[PDB]
Amino acid sequence: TINTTDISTLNTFIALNLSFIQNIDFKAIELYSSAEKRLASS
Amino acid sequence: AEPGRVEATYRVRTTVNCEIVDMIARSAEPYNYFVTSLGDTVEVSPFCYNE
């Protein structure tokens, strides 16, 4: 009598191995700073 | 001068002044006219008679 764990066990799984996607933080941008905006005025 | 002397009507004193100032002027992108820091306005191109 021996344990069943010692016996080699084969597996049949065609693993999907997918790949999710998330967590893309969106920085806020501005083309012109305030300095040139003030300088924009005569 | 303003003498303020004893006259019936008024004095007639007068003076003149030559004023020479330096200031800063700004123009837009088309550069066809511009303005000065003193506030005076003008409708001529700052670029002219220079190529």
Q: DSSP readout, B1-51?
A: -----S-SS---------------EEE-TT-S-EEETTS-EE-S-SS-S--
Method for this entry: cryo-EM
Residue A35 phi/psi, 5° resolution? Answer: -60, -55
- Specify the resolution in Å: 3.6
Q: Which residue has the tokens 């002027």?
A: B25
Residue A36 phi/psi, 5° resolution? Answer: -70, -25
Please count the helices (runs of H) and the strands (runs of E) in chain A: 1, 0
